Design a protein around this ligand. Structure first.
Ligand SMILES: CCCOP(=O)(O)OC[C@H]1O[C@@H](n2cnc3c(N)ncnc32)[C@H](O)[C@@H]1O
Length: 650
């Protein structure tokens, strides 16, 4: 075989995991929407792509969402000019579909499990309460003169009212622009200025992991260089003293107490913008309304096999696309219960995720490989003595998951009775692009497996620009046709949208990730194209080498980067984080490095061995958990963790 799975300890012949009994409709669990086998996935998926797929999409759109005006055209437009359109004559409102319609059916159903930073302050927020607060905030925004199409910035931490703020903007047709709470005054300022908002929603402070986010102080420093912001609405989350500018700043509770607890829904065109989401110049990714909402609704239902009484626990942050799509929009559109988790995986202790699961009897958990590796670094007794049997599906998103981490997840979070859904997608795709359907697909550790409904993906050889036909091929991932939830533009910079996604391989969407299709047709997403390392013609992916390294005992997490080398073209440089109890004095470091190199050669090949290996306490990571390999690549080529890496490279 040309294409290999990511390195694992389990032989490939013992590494295929069929959907387990909790996803077979046994033990009183819901029967899967799609099952029981690969063929049942294909039979349904084939209706969603190709020249006769309008029928399925029109039916799903009409069955999944409540519309004010029906659409007439299913899809139009394309990559070349970025004029993608779905359901364009239709009208609807995201707030109506995430709140009103469920409130009318069962107003006392829990919409949000609000898991506070302190476990004792947690509570359930009914659909009724969420909708009432959403309408109050909507009424407040309208009283500031916010109109359909205006941008509103949101600088909120992970408290449940973040959902009300998003949905209040959606209710009146304002375009929300959420900024991760804890970004600097400079970074907030850049995003506030770019979207030209006149209103900002924030908190006095946030609380995360027992620490204080000085959100209002950050805001005050940012707004000194934001001439357009006229109104700031401040949620009294801690009640500790914070500065308040007269006229500009008002308290959330005092404003909302003046307003009615209902507010009508603005009737939005399918293609009206729903939100801008900046990704780190900051790219303002724009999603419209109907296709984005339909895509989040469908992926949530089918990738996590959501059923009406489920309690879906996505542990991400609403500042991230993962929080947009699988905390707020996806789960609320489906009318189920969604978690807003305010803390960290290790606060107060690393048992927190599993205390949370057992407390609330969560049925699906969705988190990042960075969190999984973190909890793996902390040992098995924080999870061994938990029930966790309410879970059926375990999700991973954000980066390739090393099969070693996949097994830890499977063994201890799932007790070998959950399906593991490795979900590949991006801010720009709006919703999950490639993922196993848990009641149909037999999983391989580290493989996203098969494309979602509406996704028709190919592998292009970047050295020729041409599509590689068949299986057992590797290259760069591309999509052949638009899908309902694709980002529609980059805010006021459409040329950069076209140049970034539509120009590199004309006729296709370019994800920017390297990928492989193995002999069974399973997709393997192996890292960013920019992070590929070319050693003497051998194009190595980051996930390959990093998965090899973590197979060594004591390794907690690694990152590899390439650097210029006059003999091999490029050479591999590895940064390795060992588990904290590992005895660095008993094992001579020069011996560890040699055993690591030897391990990489066995699984991958002789060329793949690192030229150098740096031992570090941590890697530079974004708030979402992405490893900043571009930073490490530069330090090799000439917050506080980066200064330590530069020092260790000298
Ligand atoms: C979807 C939440 C994160 O969205 P962002 O826009 O922040 O980042 C998208 C990138 O994260 C990766 N990525 C995400 N998930 C996986 C994944 N499951 N497997 C492999 N790589 C992945 C891929 O590199 C992709 O280009």
């Amino acid at each position: 075989h040309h294409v290999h799975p990511l390195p694992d300890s389990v032989p490939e012949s013992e590494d295929l995991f069929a959907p387990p009994p909790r996803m077979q409709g046994k033990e009183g669990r819901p029967k899967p929407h799609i099952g029981p086998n690969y063929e049942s996935y294909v039979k349904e998926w084939a209706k969603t792509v190709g020249p006769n797929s309008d029928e399925w999409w029109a039916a799903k759109a009409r069955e999944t969402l409540d519309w004010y005006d029906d659409f007439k055209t299913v899809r139009a437009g394309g990559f070349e000019h970025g004029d993608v359109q779905w359901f364009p004559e239709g009208t609807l409102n995201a707030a109506y579909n995430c709140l009103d319609r469920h409130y009318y059916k069962n107003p006392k159903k829990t919409a949000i499990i609000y898991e506070a930073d302190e476990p004792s302050e947690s509570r359930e927020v009914s659909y009724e309460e969420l909708m009432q607060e959403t309408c109050r905030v909507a009424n407040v925004l309208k009283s500031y003169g916010v109109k359909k199409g205006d941008a509103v910035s949101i600088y909120l931490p992970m408290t449940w009212q973040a959902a009300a703020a998003f949905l209040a903007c959606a209710r009146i047709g304002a375009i929300h622009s959420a900024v991760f709470a804890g970004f600097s005054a400079e970074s907030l300022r850049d995003r506030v200025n770019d979207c030209e908002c006149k209103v900002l929603i924030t908190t006095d402070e946030g609380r995360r992991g027992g620490k204080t986010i000085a959100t209002k102080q950050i805001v005050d420093a940012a707004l000194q260089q934001c001439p357009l912001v006229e109104n700031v609405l401040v949620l009294r989350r801690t009640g500790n003293k914070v500065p308040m500018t007269e006229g500009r700043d008002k308290w959330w509770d005092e404003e909302c107490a003046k307003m009615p607890a209902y507010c009508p829904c603005e009737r939005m065109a399918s293609e009206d913008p729903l939100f801008i989401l900046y990704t780190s110049k900051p790219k303002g990714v724009v999603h419209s309304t109907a296709g984005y909402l339909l895509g989040t609704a469908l992926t949530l239902k089918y990738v996590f096999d959501a059923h009406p009484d489920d309690r879906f626990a996505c542990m991400a942050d609403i500042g991230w696309i993962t929080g947009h799509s699988y905390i707020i929009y996806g789960p609320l559109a489906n009318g189920i219960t969604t978690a807003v988790f305010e803390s960290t995986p290790v606060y107060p202790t690393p048992s927190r995720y599993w205390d949370f699961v057992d407390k609330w009897k969560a049925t699906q958990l969705y988190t990042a490989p960075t969190a999984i590796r973190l909890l793996r670094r902390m040992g098995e007794d924080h999870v061994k003595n938990h029930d966790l049997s309410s879970l059926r599906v375990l999700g991973s998103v954000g980066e390739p998951i090393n099969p070693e981490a996949w097994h830890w997840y499977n063994d201890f979070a799932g007790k070998n009775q959950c399906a593991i859904v490795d979900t590949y997608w991006m801010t720009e795709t709006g919703s999950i692009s490639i993922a196993p359907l848990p009641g149909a697909i037999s999983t391989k550790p580290g493989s996203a497996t098969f494309p979602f409904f509406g996704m028709d993906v190919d592998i292009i050889d970047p050295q020729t620009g041409q599509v590689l036909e068949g299986n057992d091929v590797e290259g760069v991932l591309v999509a052949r046709r638009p899908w309902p939830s694709i980002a529609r533009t980059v805010y006021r910079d459409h040329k950069r949208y076209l140049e970034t996604y539509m120009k590199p391989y004309p006729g296709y969407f370019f994800f920017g990730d390297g990928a492989a299709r193995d002999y069974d047709g399973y997709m393997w997403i192996k890292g960013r194209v920019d992070d590929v390392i070319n050693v003497s013609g051998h194009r190595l992916s980051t996930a390959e080498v990093e998965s090899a390294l973590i197979l060594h005992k004591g390794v907690a997490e690694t990152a590899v980067v390439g650097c210029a080398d006059d003999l091999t073209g490029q050479a591999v440089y590895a940064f390795v984080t060992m588990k904290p109890e590992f005895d660095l004095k008993a094992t001579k470091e020069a011996d560890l490095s040699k055993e690591l190199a030897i391990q990489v050669r066995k699984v991958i090949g002789p060329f793949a061995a690192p030229k150098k290996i740096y031992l570090v306490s941590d890697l530079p990571k974004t708030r979402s958990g992405k490893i900043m390999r571009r930073v490490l690549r530069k330090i090799v080529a000439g917050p506080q963790i980066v200064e330590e890496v530069k020092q260790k490279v000298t």
